[PDB]
Write a protein that binds this ligand. Sequence first.
Ligand SMILES: [Zn+2]
Ligand SMILES: [Zn+2]
Length: 122
Amino acid sequence: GSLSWKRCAGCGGKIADRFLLYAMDSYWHSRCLKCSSCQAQLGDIGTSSYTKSGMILCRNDYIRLFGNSGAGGSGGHMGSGGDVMVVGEPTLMGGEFGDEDERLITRLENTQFDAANGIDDE
Ligand SMILES: [Zn+2]
Ligand SMILES: [Zn+2]
């Protein structure tokens, strides 16, 4: 698309689908990307993605795996978390583990993004 294809690291490679996602500088499918533990829709919980141990985790997954206590001695470290689970609605803007290690999800599931492999009818 705007650049060269980065292939789905979830399944085979070439994404000839309408539902594409960008993660880790590669491409993924909605259920190809997926969580670590929950196995939910990373692109539906908001825009956020955590990559550690070579794994792909959501915000909740992250707190469960590498959720080091970063709430109490955190004066700043806010704004991070593109999710709509904890930072979607104002609940606690105190920067409780507001790790900026995320922001790896690029999502437009249609011919809006690089989900355009080719336009060919049957
Ligand atoms: Zn895939
Ligand atoms: Zn998860």
